[PDB]
């Protein structure tokens, strides 16, 4: 079952930054190859970050974006 959980995805870190992109599609913490995207950001989101724990891993809320 898909679960809402306010804590960071394994292997990742969230930086609150104005420099971040705007809210967009909810992305999974791992790529299609299985590589962790280590550094994430958000503009005005509060920690701990919104995440979805799904059958294939950890997804981040719409506000949380990859850093580069």
């Amino acid at each position: 079952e898909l679960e809402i959980r306010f804590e960071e995805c394994p292997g990742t870190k969230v930086h609150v930054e104005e420099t971040c992109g705007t809210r967009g599609p909810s992305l999974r913490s791992t790529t299609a190859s299985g590589r962790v995207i280590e550094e994430w950001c958000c503009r005005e989101c509060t920690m701990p970050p919104l995440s979805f724990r799904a059958k294939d891993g950890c997804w981040y809320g719409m506000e949380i974006r990859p850093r580069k």
Partner: antibody
Amino acid sequence: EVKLQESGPGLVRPSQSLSLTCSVTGYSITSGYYWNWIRQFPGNKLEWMGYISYDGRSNYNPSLKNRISITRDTSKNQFFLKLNFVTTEDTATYYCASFYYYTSRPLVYWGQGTLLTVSS
Amino acid sequence: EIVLTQSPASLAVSLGQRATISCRASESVEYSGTSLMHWYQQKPGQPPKLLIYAASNVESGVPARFSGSGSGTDFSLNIHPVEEDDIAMYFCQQSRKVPYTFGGGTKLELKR
């Protein structure tokens, strides 16, 4: 940052026991990944030895399923290659590697490797 | 055990020219329409590095001059234009069935 690092004795006499450590950094070994051991003989042929899952389930290469164990230390965040006895034919460079479970299972992470010589 | 046969064992290619390595599997590597076949590049003194996964998907960070193709039991890695960095060993690897197996490797040498 996700890092895998091997460590071991380097030289082991024949018929003795072998244990190699792979320390994992920046990710808990109790999530997501299958943690593998691959060795590269002289001549560069690669042989997959086995893995242990994030659940603690193990699977072994049938070529080794009389002498091999792959254990883990969840508190230290390491997993190990345990070979009950070694021959001179086990001389190789030993790699630890991982693949994510919900993928086509490519080995996305590798350790730097550790050289193991087996000789009297 | 799924046997992977790579060809050629070695190959010399001059800069800018196309280099294509082939891998053939003893049985089909497809599963659910996905080719469980991956490509790696290994330099001397270094671990293998993932180049192509699922036989056609270029991993993040890998230059666009690499490409993969094939299905079933026949796959091919393509490098064009070959650059100086690209001198290395290249391995195919199937993850369709356990135990996982690799090709014998293909040594890429440069012409000068």
